[PDB]
Symmetry: C7
Subunit: 244 residues, 7 copies
């Protein structure tokens, strides 16, 4: 299972039921991206002695950035499941949250957890920019701590917030590649000819400029157990205005 924590005052409490792990394979990122992040984070988890020998704070931060519906929240959920880590949901835009409380919350994060700061562009007894920077990477910051940040708008982030030592790895999570379309078709319609996934991908890339994995999921939801339906109705993915 994957345990979710939320902040209640200065302490972390479980949020609802332990959740079924989303399998990492059920999230289709651009080719090699999932492997690169998993390798990076396993190398961090496996090498505390390398950090302590060199006097380096034993912490790592990740930033996933890009358009809505491309896999940021889903990937972090699946990654937590893959690493048997829990997730601490830390809201930076919150009445009770002070610099003092943030420092304490980061210091008492359950072990084997990812601290998740969603939509960190929207932050900027209340939090200050300097409080956030010094909690993430300052004199009092604690060790064995992994932080994930997300944003739709990396251009809005102050460079100081995401410099190495606060964010160690930045990854763009984008609209579907050819490879993501064939991989997603094969996951939703297992045991079809690879040639049929190819047919689907070629035609989607000709009917669209940009398509999110969320749109691809939503389309396959209209053709449950109907792979030929999925391949025949691709013109419906051509963008269409709202009614005015």
């Amino acid at each position: 299972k994957t345990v979710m924590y939320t902040a209640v005052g200065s302490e972390w409490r479980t949020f609802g039921y332990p959740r079924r792990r989303r399998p990492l394979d059920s999230v289709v990122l651009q080719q090699g991206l999932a492997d690169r992040i998993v390798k990076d984070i396993r190398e961090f988890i496996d090498n505390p002695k390398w950090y302590i020998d060199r006097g380096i704070p034993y912490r790592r931060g990740y930033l996933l950035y890009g358009p809505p519906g491309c896999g940021k929240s889903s990937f972090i959920t699946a990654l937590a499941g893959e690493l048997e880590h829990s997730i601490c949901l830390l809201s930076l835009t919150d009445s009770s949250l002070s610099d003092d409380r943030l420092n304490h919350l980061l210091s008492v994060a359950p072990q084997q957890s990812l601290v998740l700061l969603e939509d960190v562009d929207a932050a900027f007894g209340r939090l200050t920019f300097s409080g956030l920077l010094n909690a993430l990477d300052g004199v009092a910051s604690t060790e064995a701590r992994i932080v994930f940040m997300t944003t739709n708008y990396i251009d809005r982030l102050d460079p100081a917030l995401i410099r190495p030592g606060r964010v160690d790895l930045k990854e763009y999570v984008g609209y579907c590649s050819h490879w993501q379309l064939t991989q997603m078709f094969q996951r939703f319609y297992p045991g079809q000819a690879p040639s049929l996934a190819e047919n689907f991908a070629e035609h989607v890339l000709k009917a669209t400029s940009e398509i999110s994995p969320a749109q691809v999921q939503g389309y396959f939801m209209l053709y449950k157990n109907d792979p030929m339906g999925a391949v025949h109705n691709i013109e419906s993915l051509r963008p269409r205005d709202h009614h005015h």
Copy 2:
């Protein structure tokens, strides 16, 4: 069968007044095929949890009804709830007590077999933040077996991220009367008249008006109770008239 309304008191849902008489689905006249398409979609969602769990997809669905005042959004959602024997949870996003924390908890403890209703979601944009809403609707901590309905008169005011697939799965325009809605409404208000008389009413209404809401048609029929010939003879009164 009745329809139970819930409102939020703190972090919990409480019944709001009496159980209400179900509005029959047939008493709401949407554009041809629209009601059937939404009922089919939502029954397919309710009937297929295993399809979602097998593929690791969050078992949640969101609906947006958009369009001008008086065209059937609130009445359809009431009737739909009745058809599916679902209750309705009335969630006001513009509300002093509602924080990101409370919204997360309220969505997590929604009565089973309920539609969470967010009316006028354009008017939303401690207290609630835009990121808190997006992450409650589709984020790491969002709960399963959850159906959300949103409405707006102004879809052009909504941020794309709020209504992307995975937050909103189906968007439907609910507009001014078609020819078909006029004949269907005439036959419901004046049962056992010749179809030719409903036709006469529809043709003449569409020549006297550029746009007419179902609410206006209802209001007109209210002046001609049990007087179908009255309704057919006084259509020039629907030609728009200034306030004094």
Copy 3:
């Protein structure tokens, strides 16, 4: 009598004494207007089955709009008396009133009452969407009659007063010839109709617009003096403040 209720928190409480009913006849609207509103509201009260058979929310809303002093508040008082209804005074500009409280207040309105929203233009704590959804939304209750007033209908959002929120909109204006003769005959009973005619003709020549409130105020200067009223009409010709 007519009972007035005001909101205390989420509940309705009586306001002062039960009031003497104002007779409907003592409020003089434009010819046919009062009869049309009474007929409409009695048809609503008498026809719940017509609504339920067709699946229509059993609710009706009224908007009276127009210049100060022409009969909106007085008519609603008299109408309540005529229908043996009470009145619930709901102030939309009020510190304690939230969307939640408004919903609950409309749901526990005493039966056989008119909910009165005076000066509904001045509302736009309560949100616009909260008001619209209380008046006509999923949780709105049945057997409910709402009256709205405004001096400024052009300031109202169309969504607030669309059919299903407001079912009947009526303009309440400055005196017609007919209102002037009817008012003269009520204030000076047992005079020749020709004397009411003399009064009306001369008032319409001395004035561009005159409210019933001004006509009442004028007759108050000539209590039991109908000849005084007919002789001093040039005093109604508009005169600046100093």
Copy 4:
């Protein structure tokens, strides 16, 4: 013999303010010729004729607006009028933290009987009070009967017409700078038992030395010549307007 009781609002209720006050005699306030008589006649006709109102279905309420420049008789007249009618005065401040629409409605409904409710400087008003709350308290569905309201302002042009329409304000009176008649009347009150010809001399000369003079200025001048009517008549050039240093 009789006194005038002042009430102020404490929460939703009226309480006495200090001592019962000695009545100012109506004759000690000198308004323009006929004005005091017209207001007294109007208000006595209202007090004496409840049946006329009830028979015709008309709300048994009356409102008065006194308007004009500072120091011309508005507050002093209302004090003297209250004394003449053996009425108390309820001092209602519309600019006040605690005052809501709800509290105003309740305060007007429990006003001591035989009182004038006084709204001084009603131009300066425009939880907390709203314009609609004030209009509906003064003349709306829940307004109470046997109620007399007096409003004052220095600035009638700032008042919304809806606030002072008939049924909220029934009688509007301008209270202005001294007429010839007010000058002779004031001289005769401050210097009783002088020849009318001496009051005439005073009035003619004051109107030649001044464009505008308030009764408050005339009172202030007579205060410099207590028991000295010839002094008052001889020093009128001192009333010619003079800059601040």
Copy 5:
């Protein structure tokens, strides 16, 4: 020997502020010739004539405004005047968190008898106090009798005429920079037993070295020449205005 009691507002009531103070002698405040006598005469005539007011139905109240530049004698005169009349002083701050229209009305109604209510810097005023609340407290239906109010300001042009009309303010006096007469009078008070000719020498030379000089500046100058009248007369060029270091 008499003292002067100072009161401040605590809520709706007046309380003594520190010790009873030594009376400043009226003669130790040097106003322009005749000004002090005119104010004393006016205020004694008010105190002595309640019957004249009651017979004519006139509110038994009087208000005074002293206005003009800093350091010319407004606060010191009012202190000395209070002492001369054996009156106490009520210090009423109009710019104050707790002060409402209601509280001001009550405070003016329970002012200790034989007191001057002092509103310093009344230009700076313009729940919480409103303009109408102040006007109606000073002269309105509920205002109380046997009440004397003193207002001061450096800026009379900033006062609304309604605040200072007769019946709120009955006497306005300008308190200005030193006349020739104030300079000779002040020299004779600081250096008793000197020839009038020496006070004359001082005054003539000060008026040639300065455009404007406050009594406060003259006091401050004499403080440099305690018991040294010839020093005072010899160092007058030091009163020629001199910039701050910039």
Copy 6:
């Protein structure tokens, strides 16, 4: 020792330990300035009868003004020590401080104290301008009271705040004269030839346009017991930009 008081509500309380007196001689003001202020304040303390005979409020106020680091706070500390006076630290920018509280605090100041108002330019329930003027010199002001004000910005002070009777003596406290440089050198390096102090002063005034006593102190701190070091490294006092 010198006792420091701070305001707690309407009353004065001791702040920490009694402090070692800074010797007056250890503060080097422009030639004759210290002597003129000491003479003035001793003349005030010694002459209450002169004030009472003439009816003059027995109060005196002082304003020290000028650039940062030139001796205002250190002089007032040393002066208090020389006169065996305590110091009352009155902050005018303070949430709790009302007109009422300021009046009471000035009236109950410990006897034989200087009331110190630092940075009086920065002031302009809560304090008002009129409250401050009337506390300093008004009807209820108390006697035997000495106030010191400081500012870096005398041009920002309203003339009414610092008129005679509120402020009786204004003194500018400026950048080093030749005399202050030789005096400071002789204090930091006792028992050197006057010629060496001269060498130091001449060269500092050629390398600098403006130098504060604080800068001279800071320089001598780099050359403790090294007077030749001090004389040899003067080019280091030539102004240098920040790395920006």
Copy 7:
């Protein structure tokens, strides 16, 4: 170990665990800078008598300024460890912090501690500018007190805040020199030929205009125990845009 304190009201409390000391050698500043600050601060700690004899307040202040990720927070941590000093974390942007509380907090700082004001540019019932100046260097300031300030933006600081006697030593902490690159390579890859560190430094300075030590650390983290990898992949440090 190194003990961290944070403010709780008017008093200092330990923050989590005593931390492992960062060795001073693990922080690579520009050549000679570390030695100059250590020498200065040891001279201050060792010479109270020199201060008391001359009447000089026994206090010293330090300002480290420059771009993000160049060694300000790391150096102060390591310096505290080297001097066996604790660190008091004082947040100037904080709801509860008044002028009064700041005065008291500076007066009861644990002995043998550095008071740390991070991001002092961001400060400018509640703290005022004058309150801060008078706490740092005023009549009531306490002795045996060491303050460190940092900023990314020294141009935003008012000169009065950082004048000698408030700040005694200002040091720029910048992007990597040639010397910092060879020193960092030799620390991360001990026992390699100096010639290899040289190869690394020359090539990094040709591929970059500016590189922070934080970026160098981040790069070496990709080549743990792979010095030839570090030397071969330097073109990867050439700046690269975020995906738009």
